[PDB]
């Protein structure tokens, strides 16, 4: 089998920049190399086939070159919506094999998060469990610290968080953190606070609610 190697799993760039992604085959594959773009939540989309041909409807900013073992995919002016994982693939001989992908990530100016806190619903409280959720909306860069406090005491070990991929229009991330307590613990405390530290905030921002108020 033929191995296709992309040298980087990640490539940092900025909108309007030219970026090139390399893919090297372990055997001479002539010009039989395709390039796909896989945006978050979607299947791969074919951009280039036979090393340098654009597929129907593919924008002119995408090109490919190479022949033999060394192939390059280039975006001549990166657009915000070009955030994706790019894969090369050889279509030279079976089994068809893919490179391991290179995720483009876009540098942009600092944006502070807009922070929101949500109490558990009374519906859920019937169930015996309380989930409190904190949303950090549309910030950059990725690095952010969310600290939960319940009656002013720092929590640890009872939250999980997740973060979206860079947005296709504004290049920001958003983050959800969920603090999980039993219903009896939630009912016994009064003040629930999400404290957010981010490069865009001159000091940490706290959003909070009082149970029952």
């Amino acid at each position: 089998d033929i191995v296709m190697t992309q040298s980087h799993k990640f490539m940092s760039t900025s909108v309007g920049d030219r970026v090139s992604i390399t893919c090297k085959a372990s055997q001479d594959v002539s010009t039989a190399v395709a390039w796909y773009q896989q945006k978050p939540g979607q299947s791969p989309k074919l951009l280039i086939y036979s090393a340098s041909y654009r597929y129907t409807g593919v924008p002119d900013r995408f090109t490919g070159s190479g022949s033999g073992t060394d192939f390059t995919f280039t975006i001549s002016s990166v657009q915000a919506e070009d955030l994706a994982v790019y894969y090369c693939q050889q279509h030279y001989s079976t089994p068809w094999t893919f490179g391991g992908g290179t995720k483009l990530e876009l540098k942009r100016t600092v944006a502070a998060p807009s922070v929101f806190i949500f109490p558990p619903s009374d519906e859920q409280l019937k169930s015996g469990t309380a989930s409190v959720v904190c949303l950090l909306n549309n910030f950059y860069p990725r690095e952010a610290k969310v600290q939960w406090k319940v009656d002013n005491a720092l929590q640890s070990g009872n939250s999980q968080e997740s973060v979206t991929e860079q947005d296709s229009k504004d290049s920001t991330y958003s983050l959800s953190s969920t603090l999980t307590l039993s219903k009896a613990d939630y009912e016994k405390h009064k003040v629930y606070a999400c404290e957010v530290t981010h490069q865009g905030l001159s000091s940490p921002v706290t959003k909070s609610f009082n149970r029952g108020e």
Binding site: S43, L46, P119, S131, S162
Partner: protein
């Protein structure tokens, strides 16, 4: 327009088989090859096999003959069958149509179907509101909790609302059940007046839930 769509089981118990149907439209299966490719969550792509317009098949040797493919040209269906599933077979499975110049590159793909290999039980979600604060941009959402396996989808106001929506990656809790939130920011001014409903679908459990989200 050329379209392919997979239908798969969601969960397969270990050692048992996987059957996936790829229904296509927009083209004739007698004239194009259809391939199967899979992608473990967060990982890369692995080509599995193809069935030619004419009926012949070829399979990746790595699958150790566990995989076969058949089709029904008249009903525009291609079927993947793979025996003896184990952990490495957890993945999103795609069918794709190859180009004709046949070229083994893949010009059209289905949306894929996630197969999770697990001895656990399917469980549908509970859906709770994230009600917009009474204390101007407002945020509201839906918390989608305690389901298995992945995935769920969430749209808002049946797809009418897309702008400023953020649906987060699920996280698996220690119970073995997933939890996910979907939020959206909207103008405060719409809150008295605009109705906001998150529409949740969990196909593994054949479950659909709409949840009206209101100021409390």
């Amino acid at each position: 327009q050329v379209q392919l769509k997979e239908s798969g089981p969601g969960l397969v118990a270990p050692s048992q088989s996987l059957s996936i149907t790829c229904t296509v439209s927009g083209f004739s299966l007698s004239r194009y090859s259809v391939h199967w490719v899979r992608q473990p969550p967060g990982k890369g792509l692995e080509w599995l096999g193809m069935i030619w317009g004419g009926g012949s098949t070829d399979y990746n040797s790595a699958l150790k003959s566990r995989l076969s493919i058949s089709k029904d040209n008249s009903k525009s269906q291609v079927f993947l069958k793979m025996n003896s599933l184990q952990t490495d077979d957890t993945a999103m499975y795609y069918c794709a149509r190859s180009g004709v110049r046949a070229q083994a590159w893949f010009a059209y793909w289905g949306q894929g179907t996630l197969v999770t290999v697990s001895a656990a039980s399917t469980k549908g979600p509970s859906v709770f509101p994230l009600a917009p604060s009474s204390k101007g941009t407002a945020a509201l959402g839906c918390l989608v909790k305690d389901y298995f396996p992945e995935p769920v989808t969430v749209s808002w106001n049946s797809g009418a609302l897309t702008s400023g929506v953020h649906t987060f990656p699920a996280v698996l809790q220690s119970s073995g059940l997933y939890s996910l939130s979907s939020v959206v920011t909207v103008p405060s001014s719409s809150l008295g007046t605009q109705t906001y409903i998150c529409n949740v679908n969990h196909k593994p459990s054949n479950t659909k839930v709409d949840k009206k989200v209101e100021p409390a």
